[PDB]
Amino acid sequence: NKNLIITIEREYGSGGRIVGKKLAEELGIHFYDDDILKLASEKSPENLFKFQSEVMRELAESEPCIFVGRAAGYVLDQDEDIERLIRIFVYTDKVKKVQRVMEVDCIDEERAKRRIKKIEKERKEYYKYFTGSEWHSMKNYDLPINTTKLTLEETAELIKAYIRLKGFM
Amino acid sequence: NKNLIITIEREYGSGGRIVGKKLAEELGIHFYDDDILKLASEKSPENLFKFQSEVMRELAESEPCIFVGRAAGYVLDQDEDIERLIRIFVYTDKVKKVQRVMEVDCIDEERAKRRIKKIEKERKEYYKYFTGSEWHSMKNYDLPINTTKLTLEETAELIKAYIRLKGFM
Ligand SMILES: [Cl-]
Ligand SMILES: [Cl-]
């Protein structure tokens, strides 16, 4: 009900996750990502998903928090008990993404391109398989942010600009 | 030009124009839509576009202004002189635009659904024809906005939060 829930999904190379981290700290909200949600599942891949959804909804029911990745926006959009859900998609030019991935993963240009194609494929297919909707589709979000010309900080503040407007802060 | 230029493109029934006008007033800035642009060109379907484009650039060059509609984003983006552009895509869930089209055009659900399909199709083809690119696509905009859960003021306010972040205000 009351709790503020923010879901950030994103293009690989956008820094969506980092933007999620920053934002969790500056707001003091608990933070759950791909890995934590993955390891969570251990605490049929259609079971693994069902399990992971019920976990997501439980957290939300009992805390404010920020989820990153794994069709979190879809899942929580289904939960009619949640009132303060804000769904973000972070996206960016290839040129900027290749440079981030090159640096953050220490690979070259070619390798970086292939990685972006691959993780984005994974994210898209995951989403398609489980929601039946489309990961890269506006309709699935409240606010898609183009960070082509933003710092991750500006980006974080835009999300705060938003939480504030809604009166959730 | 350090002139602030905003371009709003949108799904039919999203109130992209509505939002365009509030901002126009709220900011003390001139406002230009399809129809003014339409009547503008006049005094090929393809000469027509090259003409129209030039008027927008001249308007943008003479003064700060808001454009609603018709590949405004892509066009004003060419103008190398424009130093302060913001490109926005307004959009909304299906229910809400159906309600809007019915109310506004004073027509049925059936006709409202149909007229949405019609107008949007015109907008995709128009866009791809004159830009080579795709109309309803994120990478072509700075800020897509989903108004599904935004009161009008909230929307206008979000666009200004953005302007402030860009330091255009
Ligand atoms: Cl994601
Ligand atoms: Cl449009």
Tell me how far the alpha carbon of residue A119 lies from the centroid of ligand 1, in angstroms.
9
Contact assessment for residue A98 and residue A113, using Cβ atoms and an 8 Å cutoff = yes
Domain that holds residue B34: 1-168
Contact assessment for residue A146 and residue A91, using Cβ atoms and an 8 Å cutoff = yes
Ligand closest to the CA atom of residue B124: 2
CA nearest to A93 within chain B: B139
Contact assessment for residue A10 and residue A91, using Cβ atoms and an 8 Å cutoff = yes
Contact assessment for residue B161 and residue B153, using Cβ atoms and an 8 Å cutoff = no
CA nearest to B140 within chain A: A146
Which tokens go with A166? 């809604």
User: Rounded to whole angstroms, how far apart are CA atoms B120 and A82?
Assistant: 32
Which tokens go with B8? 């709003």
User: Rounded to whole angstroms, how far apart are CA atoms A137 and A149?
Assistant: 21
Which tokens go with B140? 């072509």
CA distances from B119 to B10, B61, B74, B89, B116 (A): 11, 30, 19, 16, 5
CB within 8 Å: B139 and A91: yes
Beta-carbon contacts of residue A44 (< 8 Å; ≥ 6 apart): none
Give the distance from residue B90's alpha carbon to the nearest chain A alpha carbon, in angstroms.
10
DSSP assignment, residue B166?
T
- Let me know how long chain B is: 169
Cβ-count burial A147-165 (b if 16+ within 10 Å, e if not) = beebebebbbbbbebbbeb
CB within 8 Å: B154 and A141: no
Question: For residue A62, how far is the Cα from the chain centroid?
Answer: 20
Contacts of B139 in chain A (CB under 8 A): 91, 93, 146
User: Rounded to whole angstroms, how far apart are CA atoms B90 and A154?
Assistant: 21
Give the distance from residue B48's alpha carbon to the nearest chain A alpha carbon, in angstroms.
31
The structure was resolved experimentally with X-ray
CATH number at residue A82: 3.40.50.300
Pairing of strands A143-146, A84-91: parallel
Give the distance from residue B143's alpha carbon to the nearest chain A alpha carbon, in angstroms.
6
Which tokens go with A89? 């998609």
* Residue that the structure tokens 């089209």 belong to: B101
CA nearest to A146 within chain B: B142
Taking alpha carbons only, the member of A58, A32, A19, A3 closest to residue A154 is: A19
SS (H, E, C) chain A: CCCEEEEEEECCCCCHHHHHHHHHHHHCCEEECHHHHHHHHHCCHHHHHHHHHHHHHHHHHHCCEEEECCCHHHHHHHCCCCCEEEEEEEECCHHHHHHHHHHHHCCCHHHHHHHHHHHHHHHHHHHHHHHCCCCCCHHHCCEEEECCCCCHHHHHHHHHHHHHHCCCC
Question: How many contacts (CB atoms, under 8 Å) link A and B?
Answer: 51
Contacts of A161 in chain B (CB under 8 A): 158, 161-162, 164-165
Instruction: Count how many domains chain A has.
Output: 1
Give the distance from residue B165's alpha carbon to the nearest chain A alpha carbon, in angstroms.
7
Tell me how far the alpha carbon of residue B137 lies from the centroid of ligand 2, in angstroms.
11
Question: For residue A112, how far is the Cα from the chain centroid?
Answer: 21
Kindly list the protein residues that place their beta carbon closer than 5 angstroms to ligand 1, a single-atom ion. Answer: A 9, 69, 123
User: Rounded to whole angstroms, how far apart are CA atoms A94 and A148?
Assistant: 9
Tell me how far the alpha carbon of residue B18 lies from the centroid of ligand 2, in angstroms.
13
